[PDB]
C-alpha cells in the first residue's frame, strides 16, 4: 500500500526536513541538554521502542514506523511537551493500527510498557510505568494531529532488499546491511534523507565491512554519491558514539537533566 509513491507522498513533501531547520527547533531543548546528551536520549528511546515492539511480537516495519512517529514528534516539539515515556508506547499502538497489525488491548499495551521498563530499563527508571490507557489514548489524539495525520512511512528495508537482490549477494550481505538499517534509527537520518538513500549507504558500509567489491555496481547507479557519503559518515560516527557511550551508566542522569512539563496553575 503506497509502494512506489515516495516522490508524491506526505513523507517526502512534508517529512524530509532541512538539517538547519531541525537544529534550530532543537535549541529549545539544548538549553537543558548538551548535543551529546540529546543524541544519547534519542538513542535511548529508540531502544525503548524496539524493546516494546519485541514484547508485543510486532514486525520490524511496525517498530520502524513507531520510531519515525516519535522522532517526528520531537523534531517539532520539546521533550517537555509530552512525556516521551508515555509517547513511546503511544507511537507503538498507533503504528500497529496504521500497519494493519491490529489494536493492542488496553491490558496488553500497558502491561508490555510496564514489563519492558521494569525488566530491561530499570537502570533508567526506578519507578513502575505510571500511565493508564486513558493517557495513551489522549496522547494519541495529540500525536495524530501534531504530525498532520501523516501516517504512511517509507523505510529503507524495502529498497535494501531490491538492491541486494540486484547485486545477487542476498545471502552474504543482507543480514549485515539489514542490521545497519536498524542502527540508522539511533540517528536523524530518517528525517533528512529518502529511504532508498539510507539503504544504499547501509549496503555500502556492509560491503566495506565484509570486503565485497561493489565499486562498479555503485558507479552504475544514477544517484548523488555525495549525499550517500554524507549518510555513510553519520553511520560511521554512530559506531564511535556507540563505543564511547554506556547508556546503562549515563541514562538516569541524562533523563534527570531533560526538561519536564510545567503543571497547570495551582
Amino acid at each position: 500500500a503506497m509502494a512506489g509513491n515516495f516522490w508524491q507522498s506526505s513523507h517526502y513533501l512534508q517529512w524530509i526536513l532541512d538539517k538547519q531547520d531541525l537544529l534550530k527547533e532543537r535549541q529549545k531543548d539544548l538549553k537543558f541538554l548538551s548535543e551529546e546528551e540529546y543524541w544519547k536520549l534519542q538513542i535511548f528511546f529508540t531502544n525503548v521502542i524496539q524493546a516494546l515492539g519485541e514484547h508485543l511480537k510486532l514486525r520490524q516495519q511496525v517498530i520502524a514506523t513507531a520510531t519515525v512517529y516519535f522522532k517526528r514528534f520531537y523534531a517539532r516539539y520539546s521533550l517537555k511537551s509530552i512525556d516521551p515515556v508515555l509517547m513511546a508506547p503511544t507511537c507503538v499502538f498507533l503504528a500497529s493500527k496504521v500497519e494493519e497489525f491490529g489494536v493492542v488491548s488496553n491490558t496488553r499495551l500497558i502491561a508490555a510498557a510496564t514489563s519492558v521498563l521494569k525488566t530491561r530499563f530499570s537502570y533508567a527508571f526506578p519507578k513502575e510505568f505510571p500511565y493508564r490507557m486513558n493517557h495513551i489514548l489522549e496522547c494519541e489524539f495529540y500525536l495524530l494531529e501534531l504530525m498532520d495525520c501523516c501516517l504512511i512511512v517509507y523505510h529503507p528495508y524495502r529498497p535494501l532488499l531490491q538492491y541486494v537482490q540486484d547485486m545477487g549477494q542476498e545471502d552474504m550481505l543482507l543480514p549485515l546491511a539489514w542490521r545497519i538499517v536498524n542502527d540508522t534509527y539511533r540517528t536523524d537520518l530518517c528525517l533528512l534523507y529518502p529511504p532508498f538513500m539510507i539503504a544504499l549507504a547501509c549496503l555500502h558500509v556492509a560491503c566495506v565491512v565484509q570486503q565485497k567489491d561493489a565499486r562498479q555496481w555503485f558507479a552504475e547507479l544514477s544517484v548523488d554519491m555525495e549525499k550517500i557519503l554524507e549518510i555513510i559518515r553519520v553511520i560511521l560516527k554512530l559506531y564511535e558514539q556507540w563505543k564511547n557511550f554506556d547508556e546503562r551508566k549515563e541514562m538516569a542522569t541524562i533523563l534527570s537533566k531533560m526538561p519536564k512539563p510545567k503543571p497547570p496553575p495551582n
Binding site: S81, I82, L144, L151
Partner: protein
C-alpha cells in the same frame, strides 16, 4: 502534559462545530459513521462540503486506514480529503471533503423508479471513471475491499461537474453480498485486486440494466442464497473455467449444496438478452471479462481501460452527464 503546550494547542485547535453548519443536514448513515452536507460559518466560500463523523470513539482500524490512505492519495476519480478535526472532548474524528451531490445508488434508484412508472455514454463514462480511479488505487497497492454504488459518488453542478469520486477507504481488515466475488463467498482468506474488479462488473451490469445483477434476499463466510443467485445468472463454473475452485475452503460445502444441472441453461448471455443488452456488443464482451468466476482469469482495470468499447462511439466524457440537464434530484436529508 506541559500546561503551556496544552493551552496553546487548545487555542489553535479548529473545532468542526465552530467552522461548519451541518446539524440536521445528514445525507448518509452507516458503518462508516455519519455524513453531512455542510456550509462554512465564515461565509468566505458559499461551497457545499461533505462532513463525515467516523463511527465510534478514537482512532479505530477503519478510521486509521481512511486517514492514512486519503492523506497520500491524489487522483481526480478518488474523493479528496481536505481536513481532519479531532474532537478531543468526545474523542470523535471528523473528515472534511468536497460535496458530491450525486452517487450511483441514488442515480440507479431513479432509473429503477422510472421503469415502474441515460444520455449516449453516461454509463460508459461512469465505467471508465470508476476503472480509472480503481486502477490508480491498485497501482498504489490499495484495495477498496467494498466497492458498491453508494460509495461511487458523482459531482453535481460546479467545476467538477459529472466527475466520479470513489469513497470510503476505511474498510480495514486483519447483510448484503451482491458485490462480493464468488471466491469470497467460498472462504477466500485475502482481499485481492480481482475482488474489486468483480465488484466493478456488478456495477456495470446494474448501470446497463438498472437491476442489481446478483440481487439476493437478506457471520458464516459462506452464503448459499447469494452463491445460488450468482449461478442463476452466470451458470455453474466448469472445472476448466476455475481449476482452483477445488482449493477453496468451502468447495466441498458447494459440492454438497449445489448441482451443476440446476443452472444448465444459465449464462450471462441469456441474462443480458432478457435485460435488452446485445451479447455481440462491445459492452457485453467487456462486462463478461469483468464478471469472470475465476479471480485469476478476471481482467485487470488497466486492461479494462484499454478495451475497444471505450474507442467505440460515443467516447467516454470527463462529465458523465455531458452538458445535459441533470434530471436527478438533489440528495434528501435524514433524522437521527
Amino acid at each position: 502534559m506541559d500546561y503551556d503546550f496544552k493551552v496553546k494547542l487548545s487555542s489553535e485547535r479548529e473545532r468542526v462545530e465552530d467552522l461548519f453548519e451541518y446539524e440536521g443536514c445528514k445525507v448518509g448513515r452507516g458503518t462508516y459513521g455519519h455524513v453531512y452536507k455542510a456550509k462554512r460559518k465564515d461565509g468566505k466560500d458559499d461551497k457545499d462540503y461533505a462532513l463525515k463523523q467516523i463511527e465510534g470513539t478514537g482512532i479505530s482500524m477503519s478510521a486509521c486506514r481512511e486517514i492514512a490512505l486519503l492523506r497520500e492519495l491524489k487522483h481526480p476519480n478518488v474523493i479528496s480529503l481536505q481536513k481532519v478535526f479531532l474532537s478531543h472532548a468526545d474523542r470523535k474524528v471528523w473528515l472534511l471533503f468536497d460535496y458530491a451531490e450525486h452517487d450511483l445508488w441514488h442515480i440507479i434508484k431513479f432509473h429503477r423508479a422510472s421503469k415502474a412508472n441515460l444520455p449516449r455514454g453516461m454509463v460508459k463514462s461512469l465505467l471508465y471513471q470508476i476503472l480509472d480511479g480503481i486502477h490508480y488505487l491498485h497501482a498504489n497497492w490499495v484495495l477498496h475491499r467494498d466497492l458498491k454504488p453508494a460509495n461511487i459518488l458523482v459531482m453535481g453542478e460546479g467545476p467538477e461537474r459529472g466527475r466520479v469520486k470513489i469513497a470510503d477507504m476505511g474498510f480495514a481488515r486483519l447483510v448484503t453480498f451482491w458485490y462480493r466475488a464468488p471466491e469470497l463467498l467460498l472462504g477466500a482468506r485475502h482481499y485481492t485486486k480481482a475482488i474489486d474488479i468483480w465488484a466493478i462488473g456488478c456495477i456495470f451490469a446494474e448501470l446497463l440494466t438498472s437491476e442489481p445483477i446478483f440481487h439476493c434476499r437478506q457471520s458464516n463466510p459462506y452464503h448459499h442464497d447469494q452463491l445460488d443467485r450468482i449461478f442463476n445468472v452466470m451458470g455453474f463454473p466448469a472445472d476448466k473455467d476455475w481449476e482452483d475452485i477445488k482449493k477453496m475452503p468451502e468447495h466441498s460445502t458447494l459440492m454438497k449444496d449445489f448441482r451443476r444441472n440446476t443452472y444448465t441453461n444459465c449464462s450471462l448471455i441469456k441474462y443480458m438478452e432478457k435485460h435488452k443488452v446485445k451479447p455481440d456488443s462491445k459492452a457485453f464482451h467487456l462486462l463478461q471479462k469483468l464478471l469472470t468466476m475465476d479471480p485469476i482469469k478476471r481482467i485487470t482495470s488497466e486492461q479494462a481501460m484499454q478495451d475497444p468499447y471505450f474507442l467505440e462511439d460515443p467516447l467516454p466524457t470527463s462529465d458523465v452527464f455531458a452538458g445535459c440537464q441533470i434530471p436527478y434530484p438533489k440528495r434528501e436529508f435524514l433524522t437521527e
